[PDB]
Amino acid sequence: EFNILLATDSYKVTHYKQYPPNTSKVYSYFECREKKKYEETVFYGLQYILNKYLKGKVVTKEKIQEAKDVYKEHFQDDVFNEKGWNYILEKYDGHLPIEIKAVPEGFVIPRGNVLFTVENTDPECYWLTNWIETILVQSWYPITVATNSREQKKILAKYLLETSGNLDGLEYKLRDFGYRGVSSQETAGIGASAHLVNFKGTDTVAGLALIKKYYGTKDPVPGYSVPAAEHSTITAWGKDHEKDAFEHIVTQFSSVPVSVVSDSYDIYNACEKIWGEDLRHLIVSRSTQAPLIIRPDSGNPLDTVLKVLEILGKKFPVTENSKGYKLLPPYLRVIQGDGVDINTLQEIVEGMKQKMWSIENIAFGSGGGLLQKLTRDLLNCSFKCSYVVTNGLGINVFKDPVADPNKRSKKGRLSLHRTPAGNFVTLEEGKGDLEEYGQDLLHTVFKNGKVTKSYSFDEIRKNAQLNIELE
Amino acid sequence: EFNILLATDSYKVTHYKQYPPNTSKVYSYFECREKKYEETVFYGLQYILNKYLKGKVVTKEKIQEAKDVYKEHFQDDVFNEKGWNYILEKYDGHLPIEIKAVPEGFVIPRGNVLFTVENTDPECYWLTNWIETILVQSWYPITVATNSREQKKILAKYLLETSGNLDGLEYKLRDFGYRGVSSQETAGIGASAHLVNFKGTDTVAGLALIKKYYGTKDPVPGYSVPAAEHSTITAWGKDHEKDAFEHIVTQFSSVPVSVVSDSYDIYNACEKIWGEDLRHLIVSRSTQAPLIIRPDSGNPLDTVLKVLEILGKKFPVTENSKGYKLLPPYLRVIQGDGVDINTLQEIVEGMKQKMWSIENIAFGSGGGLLQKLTRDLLNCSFKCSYVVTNGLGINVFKDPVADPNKRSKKGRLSLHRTPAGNFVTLEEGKGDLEEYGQDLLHTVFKNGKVTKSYSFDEIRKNAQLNIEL
């Protein structure tokens, strides 16, 4: 079972003996630090952490004993603060005397603004604020996944609109194929749920479980999949029966959309000779709600997509849409699911536009690119202390490393506000109290063991909308 | 609670309908596919087998739940209720699977079979690839352990040249990645992977996994020192950094203590605060209890060099037997910012050119050690190589025209020792010819049971560097 006393960076165990004596309050905050592009970030995932790890009776005699033993061996010394934890146990029945305030989930906020704040509500637990930093800062992952996915949605939005005239199908243009390519089951589910803030397509079904348990949606599920082949279900037929494999698969799923990987031996041959001639009569008969979706999976992504399009355009009846771009018949589409991240996605859709193919023709699939190749440096997710009370006096604290001003931190008690022009600003040094800027956008989400405000996954989806969607 | 019927890539739900009719056997394997990183460390499968695959992993309740999810998820009924119900009734919910695998901690060149998977019941031909997803996640502990080991090789080399030995090598790279990983589960997994090669971690999640899944003779696999963070310094007030430093080293006077010294001005902290104001509280410290100064900003090499030069002029420096400068024993440095395998190598080389022993320094790495890695680094891949259909065995593979690097192996595989003492993977069942001795793979899983396992102690012995051996 989970033990919050063991869920921190080892060294923080020793911190109680390091803060200034007579310190009654430690107040800290999380931002996505500016860097001298990712200009705005989606706030998502804290609620998952509050419910699964922070809430309820999280301290027990047994959890205290257990930590005392591990820490003794781990440190070869008895540094563990047993009294402080016992105090939380006896006084508050093992509930954390902490208040967390946060911007609403889904909100899209410029870099360098306070996203949430954490402080102790009992003077005895000044050390507790930064003990849970480690667990709280992991919010970086769903924040960064939601944000990176959204930036990609924007690109798809841009090219789809220009090549086709509208935004139909946008929410199915970037699918999550990342399940096998992430570092754990837990990560898979978290990361998958973060992608669902922006899209509806995923094959990482753990993602749905998390959303239902921790956020909730009107509809039965927030994510959807279509029947799709893998290399094993094609190659299993044998090197000389790829066409037998192809034909069996599209007949099994003649009524639904169906993705078929087509590069097991030669993608170009399969497209021009197998889909294009031998099996042509099985494609052109299909419904518009049941297209075949050809899936190349190797070679240079831009080059291979353009070659596949060019091939199909000459085997199938292409039309020119109202904006002047080429469109395949409704029963035929293409998905690129190899080597896709934000960079090559941009490369592909630009390359398509240059060659006069609509973005309607294509969907993208992303795995490690979407959920794994991302770190805390991407948005500079950082948890820093900015206010303390020592000897009954509050003082405004911060770091300001001389060789890196980008790592300067904010001062004092903080609040987030709407500017007159409708943008965002963070006020420092308790300046929010002057109330010249209207109301604090941060809300109490956690206080003394209790989750105090929650958001449905729907509200979240609505908060994270593109402006282009909003228009 | 974990439901294996829901821990697979969505589209695999449809695959039992996609194989050729009368397929009785599906046999697949995992490799770190050949294209830096010429050899990988095998680690992490035992965790996966025990946490996820062993025992009764299928129940009436767990079937029902999957049926409902997939019906919505697909907006249609495609879920294989019948295959899963067979497993429940016939084998009491235990998986009819056989997994063979190289020993954990083993160090193997790329492009060799690491593990194989196949169904032990004709009715369950579809099960082999169902569980690809959970098994493929083994890429992560493999890749962390490998990248971690590659870094140790670099540390070993320079420590040896600048100091003549390897004392303390196992504490020269600490895990600081606990906040910079994507999940709690990832933290433990990854921490245990780094501990294969090193003993320093601040990610406590890792000890518990090791104890539960592998086991060590010692009470714990990893260790940490008292250390400050910016909030334990900055809380004193911008004009009291000295009071903070004093309190901290006094509070931890007879044990090692790491103090971040770049809150405001690293170069002032080193030269004026540590080097003058509090100097008398350093030079009186025991060799067992050094102060370790932790810069945390600037160009990592440039900052390490200047910190070293600052300290050298303020403290008594010696020249070890190799001709390298060495700090007094109660004074060391740790760089824990921007450290990854590339910068690690930049720093130790820059140190060597300036005649500073690697004895002086230790590194902490986070995102670079545990987060910024993908399945692509080692080309970790799981592929079908052999099936039986209508009673006939077929060797199967892919060979894409545009990418010969993506070609998978053919037929039944086995791993062997060459006449020169190396590894080879034999394909097409050729291992049965018995020209290359015994298969080095061992059965580790069969029909719901783990059939072979290793202590963390033996894994560590397998993963040792050549220079160590």
Numbering used by the authors:
A (entry chain A): 8 to 43, 53 to 487
B (entry chain B): 8 to 42, 53 to 486
Question: Can I see the authors' text?
Answer:
NAMPT functions as a homo-dimeric enzyme that catalyzes the rate limiting step in the primary salvage pathway for NAD synthesis, the transfer of a phosphoribosyl residue from 5-phosphoribosyl-1-pyrophosphate (PRPP) to nicotinamide (NAM) to produce nicotinamide mononucleotide (NMN). Crystal structures of NAMPT in numerous ligand-bound forms have been reported. These structures consistently display a NAMPT homo-dimer with two essentially identical active sites at the dimer interface. Typical NAMPT inhibitors were found to occupy the portion of active site responsible for NAM binding and a tunnel-shaped cavity extending from the NAM binding site. Furthermore, we determine the crystal structures of six NAMPT mutants in the apo form and in complex with various inhibitors and present a definitive model to explain the differential effects of the mutations on various structural classes of NAMPT inhibitors.
H191 and G217 together with D219 and Y188 form one side of the tunnel wall surrounding the cavity commonly occupied by NAMPT inhibitors. A previously published in silico model predicted that H191R would protrude its side chain into the tunnel and sterically block inhibitors like APO866 from binding. When tested across a panel of structurally diverse inhibitors, H191R reduced potency across the compound families, but remained more sensitive to APO866 and GMX1778 than series A inhibitors. To reconcile the discrepancy, we determined the crystal structure of NAMPT-H191R. The R191 side chain indeed occupied part of the volume inside the tunnel region, but did not completely block the tunnel passage, thus imposing a more stringent limit on the size of linker moieties in the inhibitor molecules. The bi-aryl sulfone group of series A compounds exceeded the available space, whereas the more flexible and narrower linker of APO866 can fit through the altered tunnel. The H191R and all G217 mutant NAMPT proteins exhibited at least 100- fold increases in GNE-618 IC50 compared to wild-type.
